[PDB]
Protein backbone atom coordinates (compact mmCIF):
# COMPACT_ATOMS: atom_id res chain seq x y z
CA UNK A 1 0.00 0.00 0.00
CA UNK A 2 3.03 2.42 0.26
CA UNK A 3 4.36 1.72 -3.30
CA UNK A 4 0.81 2.70 -4.27
CA UNK A 5 0.93 6.26 -2.66
CA UNK A 6 4.02 7.29 -4.82
CA UNK A 7 2.02 6.52 -7.96
CA UNK A 8 -0.97 8.65 -6.63
CA UNK A 9 0.82 11.93 -6.03
CA UNK A 10 2.82 11.23 -9.22
CA UNK A 11 -0.19 10.23 -11.49
CA UNK A 12 -2.50 12.96 -10.04
CA UNK A 13 0.21 15.59 -10.80
CA UNK A 14 1.53 14.00 -14.06
CA UNK A 15 -0.66 15.45 -16.85
CA UNK A 16 -0.53 14.68 -20.61
CA UNK A 17 -0.33 17.34 -23.44
CA UNK A 18 -2.23 17.26 -26.76
CA UNK A 19 0.20 17.21 -29.78
CA UNK A 20 1.18 20.59 -31.27
CA UNK A 21 1.03 22.29 -34.69
CA UNK A 22 3.66 21.79 -37.38
CA UNK A 23 1.66 22.38 -40.63
CA UNK A 24 -0.98 25.15 -40.13
CA UNK A 25 1.07 26.85 -42.88
CA UNK A 26 -1.69 25.05 -44.91
CA UNK A 27 -4.03 27.92 -43.64
CA UNK A 28 -1.57 30.61 -44.99
CA UNK A 29 -1.28 28.55 -48.19
CA UNK A 30 -5.15 28.44 -48.12
CA UNK A 31 -5.44 32.29 -47.77
CA UNK A 32 -2.89 32.68 -50.65
CA UNK A 33 -4.72 29.94 -52.66
CA UNK A 34 -8.09 31.78 -52.03
CA UNK A 35 -6.48 35.10 -53.21
CA UNK A 36 -5.64 32.98 -56.33
CA UNK A 37 -8.99 31.03 -56.61
CA UNK A 38 -11.12 34.00 -55.63
CA UNK A 39 -9.64 37.50 -56.25
CA UNK A 40 -6.83 36.94 -58.90
CA UNK A 41 -8.78 34.40 -60.99
CA UNK A 42 -12.28 35.81 -60.12
CA UNK A 43 -11.66 39.40 -61.39
CA UNK A 44 -9.55 38.13 -64.36
CA UNK A 45 -12.39 35.66 -65.15
CA UNK A 46 -14.97 38.51 -64.84
CA UNK A 47 -13.09 40.51 -67.52
CA UNK A 48 -12.60 37.37 -69.78
CA UNK A 49 -16.24 36.10 -69.50
CA UNK A 50 -17.20 39.73 -70.27
CA UNK A 51 -14.76 39.72 -73.27
CA UNK A 52 -16.95 36.93 -74.75
CA UNK A 53 -20.33 38.27 -73.37
CA UNK A 54 -19.60 41.81 -74.73
CA UNK A 55 -18.86 40.03 -78.03
CA UNK A 56 -22.26 38.27 -77.50
CA UNK A 57 -23.90 41.74 -77.30
CA UNK A 58 -21.92 42.42 -80.53
CA UNK A 59 -23.26 39.04 -81.90
CA UNK A 60 -26.81 40.45 -81.29
CA UNK A 61 -25.57 42.39 -84.30
Amino acid sequence: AGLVDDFEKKFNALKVPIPEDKYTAQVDAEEKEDVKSCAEFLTQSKTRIQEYEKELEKMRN
Binding site: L3, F7, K9
Partner: protein
Protein backbone atom coordinates in the same frame (compact mmCIF):
# COMPACT_ATOMS: atom_id res chain seq x y z
CA UNK B 1 -7.66 -32.28 18.05
CA UNK B 2 -11.49 -33.07 17.76
CA UNK B 3 -12.96 -30.91 20.23
CA UNK B 4 -12.57 -29.92 16.50
CA UNK B 5 -11.36 -26.40 17.19
CA UNK B 6 -8.34 -27.92 18.91
CA UNK B 7 -7.28 -29.14 15.40
CA UNK B 8 -7.71 -25.56 14.38
CA UNK B 9 -5.57 -24.86 17.51
CA UNK B 10 -3.34 -27.75 16.35
CA UNK B 11 -2.79 -25.80 13.14
CA UNK B 12 -3.33 -22.39 14.68
CA UNK B 13 -0.50 -22.30 17.26
CA UNK B 14 1.77 -23.43 14.49
CA UNK B 15 0.40 -20.43 12.65
CA UNK B 16 1.02 -18.55 15.94
CA UNK B 17 4.63 -19.83 15.96
CA UNK B 18 5.02 -19.32 12.20
CA UNK B 19 3.42 -15.80 12.01
CA UNK B 20 5.27 -15.08 15.32
CA UNK B 21 8.46 -15.97 13.42
CA UNK B 22 9.58 -13.37 10.79
CA UNK B 23 8.34 -12.47 7.33
CA UNK B 24 5.29 -13.03 9.49
CA UNK B 25 5.11 -16.84 8.79
CA UNK B 26 8.26 -18.34 7.26
CA UNK B 27 10.20 -21.62 7.24
CA UNK B 28 9.07 -21.72 3.53
CA UNK B 29 12.76 -21.17 3.07
CA UNK B 30 15.09 -20.52 0.09
CA UNK B 31 13.54 -23.26 -2.13
CA UNK B 32 10.31 -21.33 -2.14
CA UNK B 33 12.54 -18.26 -2.86
CA UNK B 34 14.08 -19.54 -6.11
CA UNK B 35 10.50 -20.36 -7.13
CA UNK B 36 9.38 -16.87 -6.24
CA UNK B 37 12.45 -15.36 -7.96
CA UNK B 38 11.42 -16.91 -11.29
CA UNK B 39 7.72 -16.01 -11.22
CA UNK B 40 8.38 -12.53 -9.71
CA UNK B 41 10.97 -11.97 -12.49
CA UNK B 42 8.70 -13.73 -15.07
CA UNK B 43 5.90 -11.31 -14.08
CA UNK B 44 8.22 -8.41 -15.08
CA UNK B 45 8.64 -10.08 -18.58
CA UNK B 46 4.91 -9.76 -19.37
CA UNK B 47 4.60 -6.52 -17.68
CA UNK B 48 7.71 -4.19 -18.13
CA UNK B 49 10.71 -3.30 -15.77
CA UNK B 50 11.10 0.12 -13.90
CA UNK B 51 8.80 1.98 -11.35
CA UNK B 52 7.11 -1.05 -9.63
CA UNK B 53 7.78 0.87 -6.51
CA UNK B 54 7.60 4.44 -7.87
CA UNK B 55 5.54 6.30 -10.45
CA UNK B 56 6.35 5.86 -14.14
CA UNK B 57 6.38 9.09 -16.20
CA UNK B 58 5.79 9.44 -19.97
CA UNK B 59 6.30 11.54 -23.14
CA UNK B 60 4.27 13.08 -25.92
CA UNK B 61 5.30 13.78 -29.50
CA UNK B 62 4.36 13.53 -33.19
CA UNK B 63 6.04 12.30 -36.46
CA UNK B 64 4.32 14.30 -39.28
CA UNK B 65 0.90 14.86 -40.89
CA UNK B 66 1.68 12.17 -43.55
Amino acid sequence: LDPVQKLFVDKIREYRTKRQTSGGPVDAGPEYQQDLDRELFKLKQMYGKADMNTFPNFTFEDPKFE
